[PDB]
Each structure stands twice: as structure tokens, then as C-alpha cells.
């Protein structure tokens, strides 16, 4: 029903719910579904449980439609969240963090370094993004001693002394220059929203400044694990947004829509399959060919196989009259004659069986299964390990079936 949809949009980030990672979030919500179970009542219930209150109040916008037409006319710990949600408190007590760990972060000259709550799995999601906002500056107004970015998960004193090491892919605010560089960007100062994101399709790390996309800083970073990372000198503080509480500034949703449309453009723009011919001695053997499936629209084999599957599904479901109408329409339209004869034999056999007293759903289920199997096994793009991986951009149930 709509209440589950309202709760899952009120709990999780919106851009994460349009990726193939949304299955795991749906499973996580439905496992702990007893806690939760016209959107004003749902928002009030979520605030009573607590999703819209801290201490800076988590406000919400609610329009007034009737008046407008009148005058004119930790729960995330309980659920099992596996993505970063807060900064981690260092055991040496060198930082000041708030209760929620995102609202304030101030060091208590050497850098104070810290990382996030959890790491980012390589084979699970498509695009990750989070923002920071500089609240105070301890030099010039547009010069802050903050380094923000990502860190490779397999030197900490080197990070405290210098600001970064060889495993940090980040953006430095004291000179406007990336860590392991080049003319990329400019330094940021007070009241500046700096966003960091990673793209797992082509595998690149990008940064944004006040809603403007600043380009790709690092490239060819696939099959790796990263953690958010920040380094601050004492005197300046940041506010972090991982997307759970408030809305982003960037419009990352448009970025994701552009990449999904590019992937869909790249992909989508005999007549009996028989048994699997590569079973010998009970095991799968690799044929020494280039492809195993050789169906195409331009040769007419794909519509013929689709028509055979449609006829078999219609007969199997007890819709023999509809199959007869489909066969008549195929006769009216006219290796199609062999398809006509095979279909006619199928209705004759079904009529004989009915007088004496599937494959499509397998295609759908196998399509979903091979999309997920491609996702979780880190397949290469086309030939090289640097090509984009378009299967990461496909949500099969939300973009094709519905």
C-alpha cells in the first residue's frame, strides 16, 4: 500500500531508491516492519518515533492547496543500514562531535583526521554522494584548512601532520587543489556547500561546489572499497549531510537520470531454443565462440521466438481463443510460415487434449537474476576493465516491467 511507500521514502535517500540497491533497502524495511505498521499523519508518526527532531530543528515543507485554490481561482542502527550515516569518534578524544555525529564537528599545528561509520561496498551500488558545509573559519575569508574526500580501505600520523597520504582521494580547501595531483578548482571558505561523489559505472570521483559540477578529479577507480574521510585543523568546523535528514543542493538525481538514459540507449538501441547444448557429463563447458545468443530484430528470429513463447504462454494459461486470434492475426500479417504451422499444431494439440476430458515468466525471472549476478560479481564493461558498466544503471522492476 501507499503507507509503506511513504515510510520508505521518509526513511531512506531518494536517489538511492532508484538504483538496484533498493531491493536491499526494501528487505531491510520489511524485516523491521512491525515498528511502523494524508502524508501529514505518516510524518507525525515518524516524528513521534523520531526522524524529524534534533538540537537547529528538522523542519518539513507542507503546502496549502485548499487555501491556494480559495484565494486564487537510533532507528538506522536498529534497521541494519550498511551505508555511511555518521562520523566515527576517535578514541584519543581529539574531536568534538554532536550527539548525532553529523551536525557539528570541530577539532579539539597538526590535522585532526577521521573517517565515516561504514565503508562503501564495490559490487552493490551505482552512485554515492554526500555534502559538507563550512560553518566557521579560524587568514583570508575564502581560505579554510579542511581536506574532504574518500580514503582507500585495505600513515595516520602522516595524515595528521600533512593532511593526506597516498591513499586519500580528496579536495583541499587551503589551496583549491586535489591531493595527489594541476588547475582543477578554487579554494572554498565560509558558508560553502562542497559535495563529494563516486560513480561506479565508469568509476570516477567527482566534486561539486554550491550546486555546480566541477568535473571528474580521479578516474579508473573500480573494484575498490572507499570510506568518507575528513581532516581539519583546529579552528574551523563543518556540517555533514549524508542525505538521510535533509535534501541535497546538487541535483544528483538529474546526474543519475542522465547516466541511466545513456545506458538504456546503449543497450536497447531455428525458432525453438531446445535443451542446453553445453551439458556434457553433468557440467557446463565453454563453447569457443563469441556469443551464445544470436537473436536479433533485423533478422526476424527474435520476433519469431517471442511469438512462439507468447503462443505457448497463452495456451498454458487456458486462453486458447486468444491464441487462435493471435494465430489468425499472424496469418493476416503474412521462416514465418514454420511459426504459423507450429502454432497451429499447438492449438490443435490443446484442442485434442481438451476434447479428451511457461517460458515467458522464466525469461523475466532469468533477466532479473542475470542482472543481479552481473552486479554482484564485478563484470567488466566490454573487453577492458576501464569501460563503463551499464548493468549498474538498470532497475529492472521499476524501469521496464512497470
Amino acid at each position: 500500500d501507499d503507507v509503506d511507500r511513504e515510510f520508505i521514502n521518509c526513511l531512506f535517500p531518494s536517489y538511492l531508491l532508484q538504483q538496484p540497491v533498493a531491493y536491499d533497502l526494501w528487505i531491510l524495511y520489511l524485516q523491521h516492519r512491525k515498528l511502523f505498521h494524508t502524508r501529514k499523519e505518516i510524518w507525525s508518526k515518524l516524528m513521534n518515533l523520531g526522524v524529524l527532531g534534533t538540537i537547529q530543528v528538522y523542519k518539513y515543507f507542507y503546502p496549502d492547496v485548499n487555501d491556494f485554490t480559495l484565494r486564487f481561482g537510533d532507528i538506522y542502527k536498529i534497521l541494519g543500514y550498511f551505508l555511511p550515516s555518521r562520523w566515527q569518534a576517535q578514541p584519543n578524544n581529539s574531536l568534538q562531535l554532536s550527539q548525532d555525529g553529523i551536525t557539528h564537528l570541530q577539532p579539539n599545528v597538526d590535522f585532526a583526521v577521521t573517517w565515516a561509520n561504514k565503508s562503501l561496498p564495490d559490487n552493490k551500488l551505482t552512485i554515492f554522494y554526500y555534502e559538507i558545509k563550512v560553518l566557521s573559519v579560524t587568514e583570508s575569508a575564502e581560505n579554510s584548512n579542511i581536506v574532504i574526500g574518500y580514503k582507500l580501505v585495505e600513515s595516520i600520523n602522516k595524515c595528521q601532520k600533512y593532511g593526506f597520504d597516498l591513499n586519500v582521494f580528496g579536495y583541499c580547501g587551503f589551496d583549491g587543489l586535489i591531493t595527489n595531483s594541476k588547475e582543477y578548482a578554487k579554494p572554498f571558505g565560509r558558508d560553502d556547500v562542497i559535495g563529494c561523489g563516486i560513480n561506479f559505472i565508469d568509476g570516477s570521483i567527482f566534486f561539486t561546489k554550491n550546486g555546480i559540477h566541477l568535473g571528474n578529479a580521479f578516474t579508473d577507480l573500480n573494484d575498490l572499497e572507499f570510506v568518507p574521510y575528513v581532516a581539519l585543523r583546529p579552528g574551523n568546523s563543518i556540517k555533514t549531510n549524508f542525505g538521510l535528514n535533509e535534501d541535497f543542493v546538487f541535483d544528483i538525481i538529474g546526474y543519475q537520470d542522465k547516466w541511466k538514459s545513456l545506458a538504456y540507449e546503449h543497450i536497447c538501441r531455428k525458432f525453438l531454443l531446445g535443451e542446453d547444448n553445453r551439458f556434457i557429463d553433468g557440467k557446463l563447458v565453454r563453447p569457443d565462440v563469441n556469443n551464445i545468443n544470436n537473436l536479433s530484430v533485423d533478422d526476424g528470429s527474435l520476433p519469431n521466438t517471442l511469438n512462439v513463447m507468447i503462443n505457448d504462454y497463452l495456451i498454458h494459461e487456458g486462453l486458447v481463443d486468444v491464441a487462435k486470434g493471435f494465430l489468425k492475426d499472424l496469418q493476416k500479417d503474412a521462416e514465418s510460415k514454420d511459426v504459423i504451422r507450429h502454432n497451429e499444431r499447438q492449438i490443435m494439440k490443446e484442442e485434442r487434449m481438451v476434447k479428451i476430458r511457461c517460458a515467458l515468466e522464466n525469461v523475466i525471472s532469468n533477466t532479473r537474476a542475470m542482472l543481479s549476478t552481473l552486479l554482484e560479481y564485478n563484470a567488466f564493461g566490454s573487453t577492458n576493465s576501464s569501460d563503463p558498466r551499464y548493468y549498474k544503471a538498470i532497475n529492472f522492476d521499476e524501469d521496464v516491467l512497470n
Binding site: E139, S140, A141, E142
Partner: protein
């Protein structure tokens, strides 16, 4: 006294010798509450001529920036990193020495 057509006269002790210095202002453009522009605040001609010796006159066109305590501070660290403003910067220690020499600076910072 910082009108466009205004003349100033004095000396200058260089090494141990004395020179006569004349300043003629040309354009005076002093900002207000908000200023994120690098247009020069003052402009003029400065001419130095010999007084003790027979040194010939050397006259130059100069430009100048005032110190407002919002953007252009006393120390050359709040001044932005620009190719036009990079010739006014020395060191915070040198700035502190050359400003603490004046008594009005001290009377400003002790109120």
C-alpha cells in the same frame, strides 16, 4: 585632504641623504561597507628630487589601497591571492613591525 587635485610636499631620508618628495593626486575612489573589487582606491604621481646632492628628478605613477577592517586587513594574510594584490604583501611579522612603529596604531589597538 584626499580630493582629486591635491598636492603634498615633504622630504625623504634615504640612506643618510635627504630628498624632496612631491605628490599630486589624480583619482580618489574610496569604497564603503561592501567592496569585493580590486580597482585602486588612490592614484597619483610621486616625484623625488635631490636636496643634498644633484640627483635628477625621478617621477612615477603610483596606485594605492586603503585598509578597511572587513576585506583588506592590517596583515598581508587577509589580502586575497590576486596578481594585482600580490605586490603589497611581505610578511605578517614585517607588517606588525612597520605598523607598531606608528603611535596611532597603538592608540587604535589599546582604545
Amino acid at each position: 585632504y584626499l580630493r582629486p587635485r591635491m598636492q603634498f610636499t615633504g622630504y625623504q631620508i634615504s640612506g643618510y641623504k635627504r630628498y624632496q618628495v612631491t605628490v599630486n593626486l589624480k583619482t580618489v575612489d574610496l569604497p564603503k561597507k561592501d567592496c569585493t573589487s580590486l580597482s585602486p582606491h588612490l592614484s597619483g604621481f610621486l616625484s623625488i628630487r635631490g636636496l643634498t646632492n644633484q640627483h635628477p628628478e625621478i617621477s612615477t605613477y603610483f596606485e594605492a589601497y586603503a585598509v578597511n577592517h572587513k576585506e583588506l586587513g592590517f596583515l598581508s594574510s587577509s589580502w586575497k591571492d590576486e596578481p594585482v594584490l600580490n605586490e603589497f604583501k611581505a610578511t605578517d611579522q614585517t607588517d606588525l613591525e612597520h605598523w607598531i612603529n606608528f603611535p596611532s596604531f597603538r592608540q587604535l589597538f589599546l582604545m
